[PDB]
Task: structure prediction
Amino acid sequence: PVSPLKHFVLAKKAITAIFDQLLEFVTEGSHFVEATYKNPELDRIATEDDLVEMQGYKDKLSIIGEVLSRRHMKVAFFGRTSSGKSSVINAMLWDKVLPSGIGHITNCFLSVEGTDGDKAYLMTEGSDEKKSVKTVNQLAHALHMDKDLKAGCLVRVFWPKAKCALLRDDLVLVDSPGTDVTTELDSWIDKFCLDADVFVLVANSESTLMNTEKHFFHKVNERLSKPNIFILNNRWDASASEPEYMEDVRRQHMERCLHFLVEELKVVNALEAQNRIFFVSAKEVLSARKQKAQGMPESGVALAEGFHARLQEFQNFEQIFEECISQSAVKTKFEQHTIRAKQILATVKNIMDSVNLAAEDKSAASAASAASAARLPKEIDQLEKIQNNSKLLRNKAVQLENELENFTKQFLPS
Result:
Protein backbone atom coordinates (compact mmCIF):
# COMPACT_ATOMS: atom_id res chain seq x y z
CA PRO A 1 0.00 0.00 0.00
CA VAL A 2 3.06 2.29 0.26
CA SER A 3 4.63 4.28 -2.56
CA PRO A 4 7.41 2.44 -4.45
CA LEU A 5 9.47 5.64 -4.08
CA LYS A 6 9.88 4.67 -0.42
CA HIS A 7 12.26 1.95 -1.62
CA PHE A 8 14.68 4.69 -2.67
CA VAL A 9 14.14 6.67 0.54
CA LEU A 10 14.83 3.53 2.58
CA ALA A 11 17.94 2.60 0.59
CA LYS A 12 19.31 6.13 1.00
CA LYS A 13 18.60 6.07 4.73
CA ALA A 14 20.31 2.67 5.10
CA ILE A 15 23.46 3.51 3.12
CA THR A 16 23.62 6.85 4.93
CA ALA A 17 23.40 5.16 8.33
CA ILE A 18 26.21 2.83 7.26
CA PHE A 19 28.40 5.75 6.21
CA ASP A 20 27.75 7.43 9.58
CA GLN A 21 29.01 4.28 11.31
CA LEU A 22 31.97 4.09 8.92
CA LEU A 23 33.01 7.65 9.72
CA GLU A 24 32.66 7.04 13.46
CA PHE A 25 34.67 3.81 13.24
CA VAL A 26 37.44 5.37 11.16
CA THR A 27 37.49 8.44 13.41
CA GLU A 28 38.04 6.21 16.43
CA GLY A 29 40.69 4.22 14.56
CA SER A 30 42.46 7.39 13.46
CA HIS A 31 42.70 8.52 17.10
CA PHE A 32 44.10 5.11 18.06
CA VAL A 33 46.69 5.02 15.28
CA GLU A 34 47.80 8.56 16.15
CA ALA A 35 48.14 7.91 19.89
CA THR A 36 50.07 4.73 19.04
CA TYR A 37 52.29 6.72 16.65
CA LYS A 38 53.09 9.43 19.23
CA ASN A 39 53.75 7.04 22.14
CA PRO A 40 57.44 7.48 23.10
CA GLU A 41 57.68 4.05 24.74
CA LEU A 42 56.26 2.38 21.65
CA ASP A 43 58.28 2.55 18.47
CA ARG A 44 57.54 1.57 14.87
CA ILE A 45 54.15 -0.02 15.67
CA ALA A 46 52.12 2.62 13.84
CA THR A 47 53.71 4.64 11.03
CA GLU A 48 53.25 8.09 9.56
CA ASP A 49 51.76 6.45 6.48
CA ASP A 50 49.24 4.66 8.72
CA LEU A 51 48.36 8.00 10.29
CA VAL A 52 48.01 9.84 6.97
CA GLU A 53 45.97 7.04 5.39
CA MET A 54 43.57 6.97 8.36
CA GLN A 55 43.11 10.75 8.35
CA GLY A 56 42.56 10.54 4.60
CA TYR A 57 39.82 7.93 4.96
CA LYS A 58 38.15 10.02 7.65
CA ASP A 59 38.02 12.98 5.25
CA LYS A 60 36.93 10.87 2.27
CA LEU A 61 34.09 9.23 4.25
CA SER A 62 32.86 12.63 5.36
CA ILE A 63 32.92 13.99 1.80
CA ILE A 64 31.28 10.87 0.35
CA GLY A 65 28.68 11.02 3.12
CA GLU A 66 27.67 14.48 1.99
CA VAL A 67 27.52 13.39 -1.67
CA LEU A 68 25.21 10.54 -0.61
CA SER A 69 22.84 12.88 1.22
CA ARG A 70 22.09 14.62 -2.10
CA ARG A 71 21.48 11.55 -4.29
CA HIS A 72 18.00 11.65 -5.79
CA MET A 73 15.84 10.20 -8.53
CA LYS A 74 15.35 12.13 -11.77
CA VAL A 75 12.72 11.74 -14.48
CA ALA A 76 12.89 13.82 -17.66
CA PHE A 77 9.86 14.48 -19.89
CA PHE A 78 10.06 15.09 -23.64
CA GLY A 79 7.59 15.96 -26.36
CA ARG A 80 5.77 18.74 -28.13
CA THR A 81 4.43 21.63 -26.08
CA SER A 82 0.92 20.76 -27.32
CA SER A 83 1.32 17.23 -25.88
CA GLY A 84 0.70 18.45 -22.32
CA LYS A 85 3.82 17.17 -20.62
CA SER A 86 3.79 20.13 -18.21
CA SER A 87 0.31 19.05 -17.09
CA VAL A 88 1.52 15.45 -16.70
CA ILE A 89 4.16 16.76 -14.27
CA ASN A 90 1.66 18.95 -12.44
CA ALA A 91 -0.90 16.14 -12.14
CA MET A 92 1.81 13.95 -10.63
CA LEU A 93 2.68 16.75 -8.16
CA TRP A 94 -1.03 17.18 -7.23
CA ASP A 95 -0.69 20.93 -7.96
CA LYS A 96 -0.01 23.37 -10.77
CA VAL A 97 3.69 24.00 -10.21
CA LEU A 98 4.91 24.37 -13.79
CA PRO A 99 3.24 27.39 -15.42
CA SER A 100 1.44 27.15 -18.72
CA GLY A 101 1.10 29.66 -21.53
CA ILE A 102 4.60 31.23 -21.43
CA GLY A 103 6.09 30.86 -24.91
CA HIS A 104 9.80 31.58 -24.51
CA ILE A 105 10.30 29.19 -21.57
CA THR A 106 9.18 26.23 -23.69
CA ASN A 107 12.68 26.63 -25.18
CA CYS A 108 14.19 25.90 -21.76
CA PHE A 109 14.64 23.03 -19.33
CA LEU A 110 12.42 23.40 -16.25
CA SER A 111 13.51 21.36 -13.24
CA VAL A 112 11.22 20.86 -10.23
CA GLU A 113 12.73 19.73 -6.94
CA GLY A 114 11.70 19.91 -3.29
CA THR A 115 12.86 22.42 -0.71
CA ASP A 116 12.62 21.80 3.03
CA GLY A 117 11.24 25.29 3.73
CA ASP A 118 7.78 26.76 3.32
CA LYS A 119 8.75 29.21 0.54
CA ALA A 120 9.21 28.29 -3.10
CA TYR A 121 12.04 29.85 -5.01
CA LEU A 122 13.43 30.09 -8.50
CA MET A 123 17.04 29.93 -9.66
CA THR A 124 18.29 30.60 -13.19
CA GLU A 125 21.50 29.42 -14.80
CA GLY A 126 24.69 31.41 -14.25
CA SER A 127 23.25 33.22 -11.21
CA ASP A 128 23.32 32.22 -7.55
CA GLU A 129 20.32 34.28 -6.40
CA LYS A 130 17.23 32.49 -5.09
CA LYS A 131 14.14 34.42 -6.23
CA SER A 132 11.33 33.78 -3.75
CA VAL A 133 7.78 33.25 -5.06
CA LYS A 134 4.67 32.68 -2.98
CA THR A 135 2.34 31.13 -5.62
CA VAL A 136 2.52 29.42 -9.00
CA ASN A 137 1.08 32.61 -10.41
CA GLN A 138 4.04 34.62 -9.09
CA LEU A 139 6.38 31.93 -10.42
CA ALA A 140 4.68 32.19 -13.82
CA HIS A 141 5.04 35.97 -13.82
CA ALA A 142 8.70 35.81 -12.76
CA LEU A 143 9.44 33.49 -15.67
CA HIS A 144 7.27 35.50 -18.08
CA MET A 145 9.24 38.66 -17.29
CA ASP A 146 12.69 37.05 -17.59
CA LYS A 147 13.45 37.56 -21.28
CA ASP A 148 17.11 36.52 -20.78
CA LEU A 149 16.03 32.88 -20.57
CA LYS A 150 17.39 32.02 -24.00
CA ALA A 151 17.00 28.65 -25.68
CA GLY A 152 18.54 25.72 -23.83
CA CYS A 153 18.93 27.32 -20.41
CA LEU A 154 18.00 25.56 -17.17
CA VAL A 155 15.36 27.00 -14.85
CA ARG A 156 15.40 25.42 -11.38
CA VAL A 157 12.17 25.47 -9.38
CA PHE A 158 12.29 24.68 -5.66
CA TRP A 159 8.85 23.80 -4.30
CA PRO A 160 7.97 23.11 -0.63
CA LYS A 161 8.11 19.34 -0.15
CA ALA A 162 5.19 19.54 2.28
CA LYS A 163 2.83 21.18 -0.25
CA CYS A 164 2.71 18.56 -3.02
CA ALA A 165 3.47 14.94 -3.85
CA LEU A 166 6.69 13.11 -4.85
CA LEU A 167 9.24 15.87 -4.09
CA ARG A 168 9.45 14.84 -0.44
CA ASP A 169 10.57 11.37 -1.59
CA ASP A 170 13.68 12.69 -3.46
CA LEU A 171 12.25 12.80 -7.00
CA VAL A 172 13.27 15.60 -9.39
CA LEU A 173 11.07 16.15 -12.46
CA VAL A 174 12.49 17.83 -15.59
CA ASP A 175 10.34 19.35 -18.34
CA SER A 176 12.43 19.71 -21.52
CA PRO A 177 12.12 22.15 -24.45
CA GLY A 178 9.09 21.50 -26.63
CA THR A 179 10.15 19.33 -29.55
CA ASP A 180 9.45 20.87 -32.94
CA VAL A 181 10.73 20.84 -36.52
CA THR A 182 13.49 23.32 -35.54
CA THR A 183 14.83 21.90 -32.25
CA GLU A 184 18.33 20.40 -32.39
CA LEU A 185 18.49 17.74 -29.65
CA ASP A 186 22.24 17.14 -29.98
CA SER A 187 23.55 18.40 -26.63
CA TRP A 188 20.42 17.44 -24.66
CA ILE A 189 21.80 14.07 -23.50
CA ASP A 190 24.98 15.32 -21.83
CA LYS A 191 23.07 18.40 -20.68
CA PHE A 192 20.44 16.77 -18.46
CA CYS A 193 19.98 13.14 -19.53
CA LEU A 194 22.95 10.89 -18.72
CA ASP A 195 21.78 11.31 -15.12
CA ALA A 196 18.03 10.86 -15.77
CA ASP A 197 16.81 7.54 -14.45
CA VAL A 198 13.60 7.52 -16.54
CA PHE A 199 12.76 9.21 -19.85
CA VAL A 200 9.09 9.90 -20.61
CA LEU A 201 7.91 10.65 -24.14
CA VAL A 202 4.59 12.51 -23.91
CA ALA A 203 2.71 12.46 -27.20
CA ASN A 204 -0.69 13.73 -28.18
CA SER A 205 -3.06 10.78 -28.52
CA GLU A 206 -4.65 12.32 -31.67
CA SER A 207 -1.16 12.53 -33.24
CA THR A 208 1.41 10.10 -34.62
CA LEU A 209 4.98 10.09 -33.30
CA MET A 210 7.31 12.76 -34.67
CA ASN A 211 10.42 11.78 -36.55
CA THR A 212 12.40 14.17 -34.34
CA GLU A 213 10.99 12.56 -31.18
CA LYS A 214 11.84 9.07 -32.42
CA HIS A 215 15.30 10.23 -33.52
CA PHE A 216 16.01 11.67 -30.06
CA PHE A 217 15.13 8.41 -28.33
CA HIS A 218 17.29 6.57 -30.84
CA LYS A 219 20.05 8.92 -29.68
CA VAL A 220 19.22 8.25 -26.02
CA ASN A 221 19.24 4.50 -26.66
CA GLU A 222 22.64 4.73 -28.39
CA ARG A 223 24.27 6.80 -25.64
CA LEU A 224 22.95 4.81 -22.66
CA SER A 225 22.68 1.11 -21.85
CA LYS A 226 19.02 -0.01 -21.65
CA PRO A 227 17.50 3.33 -20.58
CA ASN A 228 14.04 3.28 -19.04
CA ILE A 229 11.56 4.75 -21.54
CA PHE A 230 7.83 5.37 -21.04
CA ILE A 231 5.33 6.68 -23.61
CA LEU A 232 2.34 8.64 -22.27
CA ASN A 233 -0.34 9.34 -24.85
CA ASN A 234 -2.08 12.41 -23.45
CA ARG A 235 -5.57 13.71 -24.22
CA TRP A 236 -5.40 17.49 -23.99
CA ASP A 237 -9.07 18.03 -23.06
CA ALA A 238 -11.12 14.97 -22.11
CA SER A 239 -14.37 16.98 -21.99
CA ALA A 240 -14.09 17.69 -25.74
CA SER A 241 -16.26 15.12 -27.51
CA GLU A 242 -14.63 13.02 -30.22
CA PRO A 243 -16.21 11.10 -33.14
CA GLU A 244 -16.59 7.33 -33.25
CA TYR A 245 -13.50 6.22 -35.20
CA MET A 246 -11.20 7.73 -32.54
CA GLU A 247 -11.05 4.43 -30.65
CA ASP A 248 -9.45 2.77 -33.68
CA VAL A 249 -7.10 5.77 -33.96
CA ARG A 250 -5.95 5.16 -30.38
CA ARG A 251 -5.71 1.43 -31.14
CA GLN A 252 -3.56 2.16 -34.21
CA HIS A 253 -1.40 4.45 -32.06
CA MET A 254 -0.94 1.74 -29.41
CA GLU A 255 0.52 -0.57 -32.06
CA ARG A 256 2.85 2.13 -33.36
CA CYS A 257 4.07 2.71 -29.79
CA LEU A 258 4.66 -1.03 -29.23
CA HIS A 259 6.52 -1.29 -32.54
CA PHE A 260 8.72 1.69 -31.67
CA LEU A 261 9.74 0.35 -28.24
CA VAL A 262 9.98 -3.33 -29.21
CA GLU A 263 11.05 -3.44 -32.86
CA GLU A 264 12.74 -0.09 -33.55
CA LEU A 265 14.46 0.86 -30.28
CA LYS A 266 14.63 -2.75 -29.01
CA VAL A 267 14.72 -1.43 -25.43
CA VAL A 268 12.04 -3.78 -24.14
CA ASN A 269 10.08 -6.87 -25.16
CA ALA A 270 6.43 -7.13 -26.14
CA LEU A 271 5.27 -8.03 -22.63
CA GLU A 272 7.20 -5.34 -20.79
CA ALA A 273 6.20 -2.74 -23.40
CA GLN A 274 2.62 -3.29 -22.22
CA ASN A 275 3.70 -1.59 -18.97
CA ARG A 276 5.61 1.26 -20.64
CA ILE A 277 2.76 2.82 -22.70
CA PHE A 278 -0.20 4.58 -21.09
CA PHE A 279 -3.19 6.63 -22.23
CA VAL A 280 -3.82 9.52 -19.84
CA SER A 281 -5.68 12.83 -19.61
CA ALA A 282 -3.40 14.90 -17.41
CA LYS A 283 -5.33 18.19 -17.22
CA GLU A 284 -8.39 16.21 -16.14
CA VAL A 285 -6.41 14.38 -13.44
CA LEU A 286 -4.81 17.63 -12.26
CA SER A 287 -8.15 19.39 -11.98
CA ALA A 288 -9.67 16.47 -10.07
CA ARG A 289 -6.65 16.35 -7.73
CA LYS A 290 -6.84 20.08 -6.98
CA GLN A 291 -10.53 19.77 -6.07
CA LYS A 292 -9.64 16.81 -3.84
CA ALA A 293 -6.81 18.59 -2.01
CA GLN A 294 -9.19 21.48 -1.30
CA GLY A 295 -11.68 19.13 0.38
CA MET A 296 -14.29 19.15 -2.37
CA PRO A 297 -16.28 15.89 -2.49
CA GLU A 298 -16.18 14.16 -5.87
CA SER A 299 -19.90 13.33 -5.49
CA GLY A 300 -20.71 17.04 -5.94
CA VAL A 301 -18.47 17.86 -8.92
CA ALA A 302 -19.42 17.22 -12.56
CA LEU A 303 -17.03 14.72 -14.15
CA ALA A 304 -16.75 13.77 -17.82
CA GLU A 305 -17.90 10.31 -18.85
CA GLY A 306 -15.20 7.68 -18.36
CA PHE A 307 -13.32 9.76 -15.76
CA HIS A 308 -12.83 6.93 -13.31
CA ALA A 309 -11.29 4.51 -15.82
CA ARG A 310 -8.96 7.29 -17.02
CA LEU A 311 -7.97 8.17 -13.45
CA GLN A 312 -7.17 4.49 -12.88
CA GLU A 313 -4.85 4.43 -15.90
CA PHE A 314 -3.03 7.49 -14.59
CA GLN A 315 -2.67 5.77 -11.20
CA ASN A 316 -1.43 2.60 -12.90
CA PHE A 317 1.20 4.62 -14.77
CA GLU A 318 2.31 6.34 -11.55
CA GLN A 319 2.63 2.98 -9.78
CA ILE A 320 4.65 1.30 -12.55
CA PHE A 321 6.73 4.43 -13.07
CA GLU A 322 7.56 4.67 -9.36
CA GLU A 323 8.54 0.98 -9.17
CA CYS A 324 10.81 1.45 -12.19
CA ILE A 325 12.61 4.59 -11.06
CA SER A 326 13.07 3.55 -7.43
CA GLN A 327 14.54 0.16 -8.34
CA SER A 328 16.72 1.65 -11.07
CA ALA A 329 18.03 4.67 -9.16
CA VAL A 330 19.03 2.74 -6.03
CA LYS A 331 21.49 0.64 -8.02
CA THR A 332 22.63 3.57 -10.20
CA LYS A 333 23.10 6.10 -7.39
CA PHE A 334 24.40 3.98 -4.47
CA GLU A 335 26.37 1.06 -5.96
CA GLN A 336 29.73 2.74 -6.57
CA HIS A 337 29.65 4.28 -3.08
CA THR A 338 28.99 0.86 -1.57
CA ILE A 339 31.97 -0.59 -3.45
CA ARG A 340 34.13 2.34 -2.32
CA ALA A 341 33.14 1.76 1.31
CA LYS A 342 34.24 -1.88 1.07
CA GLN A 343 37.62 -0.84 -0.33
CA ILE A 344 38.11 1.63 2.53
CA LEU A 345 37.18 -0.98 5.12
CA ALA A 346 39.65 -3.42 3.58
CA THR A 347 42.51 -0.89 3.81
CA VAL A 348 41.56 0.14 7.36
CA LYS A 349 41.46 -3.53 8.36
CA ASN A 350 44.97 -3.99 6.91
CA ILE A 351 46.24 -1.07 9.01
CA MET A 352 44.80 -2.55 12.22
CA ASP A 353 46.35 -5.94 11.37
CA SER A 354 49.68 -4.22 10.73
CA VAL A 355 49.51 -2.49 14.13
CA ASN A 356 48.45 -5.71 15.83
CA LEU A 357 51.26 -7.72 14.24
CA ALA A 358 53.90 -5.11 15.12
CA ALA A 359 52.67 -4.98 18.71
CA GLU A 360 52.85 -8.78 18.77
CA ASP A 361 56.45 -8.77 17.51
CA LYS A 362 57.54 -6.17 20.05
CA SER A 363 56.11 -8.02 23.03
CA ALA A 364 57.82 -11.23 21.92
CA ALA A 365 61.09 -9.29 21.47
CA SER A 366 60.59 -7.67 24.88
CA ALA A 367 60.00 -11.09 26.45
CA ALA A 368 63.10 -12.56 24.79
CA SER A 369 65.19 -9.69 26.15
CA ALA A 370 63.74 -10.07 29.67
CA ALA A 371 64.60 -13.79 29.75
CA SER A 372 68.27 -12.90 29.14
CA ALA A 373 66.37 -12.67 37.66
CA ALA A 374 63.29 -13.07 35.42
CA ARG A 375 61.94 -9.56 34.78
CA LEU A 376 58.43 -8.88 33.53
CA PRO A 377 58.93 -7.56 29.96
CA LYS A 378 59.05 -3.81 29.48
CA GLU A 379 55.82 -2.00 28.49
CA ILE A 380 54.05 -5.38 28.34
CA ASP A 381 50.81 -3.84 29.63
CA GLN A 382 50.85 -1.03 27.04
CA LEU A 383 51.48 -3.55 24.28
CA GLU A 384 48.56 -5.63 25.57
CA LYS A 385 46.27 -2.62 25.13
CA ILE A 386 47.65 -1.72 21.69
CA GLN A 387 47.35 -5.31 20.52
CA ASN A 388 43.87 -5.89 21.92
CA ASN A 389 42.47 -2.54 20.78
CA SER A 390 43.74 -3.01 17.22
CA LYS A 391 42.14 -6.45 17.17
CA LEU A 392 38.83 -5.02 18.36
CA LEU A 393 38.99 -2.33 15.69
CA ARG A 394 39.77 -4.95 13.07
CA ASN A 395 36.78 -6.96 14.31
CA LYS A 396 34.61 -3.86 14.02
CA ALA A 397 35.67 -3.49 10.37
CA VAL A 398 34.45 -7.07 9.76
CA GLN A 399 31.10 -6.17 11.34
CA LEU A 400 30.82 -3.19 9.01
CA GLU A 401 31.78 -5.36 6.02
CA ASN A 402 28.88 -7.65 6.92
CA GLU A 403 26.63 -4.58 7.14
CA LEU A 404 27.58 -3.47 3.62
CA GLU A 405 27.02 -7.04 2.43
CA ASN A 406 23.49 -7.01 3.87
CA PHE A 407 22.87 -3.64 2.22
CA THR A 408 24.15 -5.09 -1.05
CA LYS A 409 21.92 -8.19 -0.91
CA GLN A 410 18.84 -6.18 0.09
CA PHE A 411 19.22 -3.20 -2.27
CA LEU A 412 21.74 -4.07 -5.04
CA PRO A 413 20.67 -7.43 -6.50
CA SER A 414 22.45 -8.64 -9.62
In short: The two ends are 26 Å apart (CA to CA). The first strand starts at residue 73 and ends at 78. The CA atoms of residues 121 and 396 lie 45 Å apart.
